[PDB]
Amino acid sequence: SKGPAVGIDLGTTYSCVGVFQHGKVEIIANDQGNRTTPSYVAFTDTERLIGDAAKNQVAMNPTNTVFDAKRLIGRRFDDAVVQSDMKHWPFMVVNDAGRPKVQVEYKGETKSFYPEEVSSMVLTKMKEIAEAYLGKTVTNAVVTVPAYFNDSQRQAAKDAGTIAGLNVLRIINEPTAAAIAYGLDKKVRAERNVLIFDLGGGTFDVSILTTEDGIFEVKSTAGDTHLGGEDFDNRMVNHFIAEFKRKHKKDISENKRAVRRLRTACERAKRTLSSSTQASIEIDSLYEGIDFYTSITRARFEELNADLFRGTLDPVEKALRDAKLDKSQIHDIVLVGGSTRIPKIQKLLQDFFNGKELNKSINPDEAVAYGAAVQAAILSG
Numbered sequence: 001s002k003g004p005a006v007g008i009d010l011g012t013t014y015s016c017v018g019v020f021q022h023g024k025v026e027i028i029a030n031d032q033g034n035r036t037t038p039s040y041v042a043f044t045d046t047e048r049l050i051g052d053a054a055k056n057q058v059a060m061n062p063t064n065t066v067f068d069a070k071r072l073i074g075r076r077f078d079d080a081v082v083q084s085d086m087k088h089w090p091f092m093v094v095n096d097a098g099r100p101k102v103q104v105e106y107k108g109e110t111k112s113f114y115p116e117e118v119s120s121m122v123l124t125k126m127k128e129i130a131e132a133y134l135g136k137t138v139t140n141a142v143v144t145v146p147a148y149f150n151d152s153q154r155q156a157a158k159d160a161g162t163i164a165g166l167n168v169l170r171i172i173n174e175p176t177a178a179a180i181a182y183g184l185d186k187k188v189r190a191e192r193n194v195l196i197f198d199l200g201g202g203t204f205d206v207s208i209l210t211t212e213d214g215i216f217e218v219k220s221t222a223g224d225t226h227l228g229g230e231d232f233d234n235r236m237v238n239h240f241i242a243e244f245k246r247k248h249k250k251d252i253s254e255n256k257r258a259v260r261r262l263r264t265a266c267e268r269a270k271r272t273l274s275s276s277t278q279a280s281i282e283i284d285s286l287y288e289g290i291d292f293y294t295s296i297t298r299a300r301f302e303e304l305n306a307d308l309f310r311g312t313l314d315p316v317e318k319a320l321r322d323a324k325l326d327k328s329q330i331h332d333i334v335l336v337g338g339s340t341r342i343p344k345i346q347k348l349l350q351d352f353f354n355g356k357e358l359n360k361s362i363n364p365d366e367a368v369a370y371g372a373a374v375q376a377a378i379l380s381g
């Protein structure tokens, strides 16, 4: 026997899967052709679309396109963290005897779903993707939950795998995976103090990790659970909403769809802003048939979020305090999280540790997956 054993990075927002076949951990590409998937589950009149095609339909299907599934998993309905977010989603999360589900309308009927199977649904597609490129049925996986996950959330995110059909070997911490990606545990026989800076698409996770000879210990976590990628897009989306409104003197705001088209355009823009210094927002017949055609500077950009971009440096210290370690004591700075591609966030942190070089060679949206797959081979039999 042998069996392809994949490591999956289930995200909050996006999830990436990857395997390591003889020598390299290759990161299973996507049907549309991406190294990701946005963690989106949609129910319409005909079908239930997971992955990308779901995310694309969220304007034209608001009330019945479920997402941010990972924020519910683990908690009971009467929890605080659910009560706050309950006021921020186009769908409905209800209670069923203390436990929550998402109520939506699937193929004309009205059904309800338990977080672990909304999150399972993603795994299922994530499952298929592994099968697509490898050419065989994939049963073994290793999943990533953040450091702040308690048994409740683990036993659920473990359960998303079981229900997906997956036989989950072990279930590990994101920050840890990252450190393993870089082989920071493959060490040189001293003690190790490592730092993880995930800056997701919705979550800012910071961790300071001690490797005491081959083994990790999870030291101190920290961050803003509502600061992230989308927020950055919101500042852009909020800006152009203004520039256009003032260019024509016609406000778009309360137009659910006009809003989204710009949205996805600001996203596209922001990403290239990490290499190029100029973005180009090009949306045809946006609103009242008017076209929108403009640009945004990388300069202009960094100043839009500047208040937020800058502020992240704060938890770095804050963990480092609880961690009972000085800036210097860290032997590794690992840039995990997609958003860490923004060069403004990069230098801010690189300056913060005073010139130190940053561990950023692997694509900050994959990284947590890379190890997930690696830690798998070891566990693979």
Ligand SMILES: Nc1ncnc2c1ncn2[C@@H]1O[C@H](COP(=O)(O)OP(=O)(O)O)[C@@H](O)[C@H]1O
Pocket: 010, 011, 012, 013, 014, 015, 198, 199, 200, 201, 202, 228, 229, 230, 267, 270, 271, 272, 273, 274, 337, 338, 339, 340, 341, 342, 365, 368
């Ligand atoms: N080249 C890029 N430049 C800037 N931001 C990016 C780039 N690529 C992706 N992002 C952003 O990073 C976020 C994705 O991080 P994500 O993959 O969700 O982390 P996790 O998987 O830990 O949730 C998205 O909001 C996306 O817009």
